[PDB]
């Protein structure tokens, strides 16, 4: 099943500066929605699959 | 004599109101610097 595994890619931390708040929304955007949402669910199918 | 006496007393009253102006603008400055905290974020 390791053939069918998408790794943990690190995304471009594109910083936005809301006044004095510097933080990259792209990074946690990818982290949540793919690196943790898509990733966990997919590996859950692989877990039930094996 | 008494006239320029109230002038002394009287721009002394302007004294106190200028001191109040000090107080107001200083507090406005502390308010904006509070809104201007230095962040320790490095990531």
UniProtKB/TrEMBL annotation, chain A:
Domain of life: Bacteria
Name of the molecule in the record: DotA
Organism (species): Legionella pneumophila subsp. pneumophila (strain Philadelphia 1 / ATCC 33152 / DSM 7513)
Originating gene: dotA
TrEMBL record, chain B:
Protein name per UniProt: IcmX (IcmY)
Domain of life: Bacteria
UniProt source species: Legionella pneumophila subsp. pneumophila (strain Philadelphia 1 / ATCC 33152 / DSM 7513)
Shown residues within the full chain: 416 to 458 of 466
Organism placement in taxonomy: Bacteria, Pseudomonadati, Pseudomonadota, Gammaproteobacteria, Legionellales
């Amino acid at each position: 099943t390791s053939l069918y595994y998408m790794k943990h890619q690190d995304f471009d931390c594109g910083r936005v500066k809301i006044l004095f708040f510097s933080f990259c929304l792209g990074r946690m955007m990818g982290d949540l929605f793919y690196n943790y949402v898509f990733r966990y669910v997919y590996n859950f199918f692989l877990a039930i699959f094996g | 004599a008494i006239l320029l006496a109230e002038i002394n007393y009287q721009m002394y009253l302007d004294r106190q109101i200028q001191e109040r102006i000090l107080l107001t603008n200083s507090i406005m400055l502390l308010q904006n610097l509070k809104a201007a905290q230095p962040t320790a974020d490095f990531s």
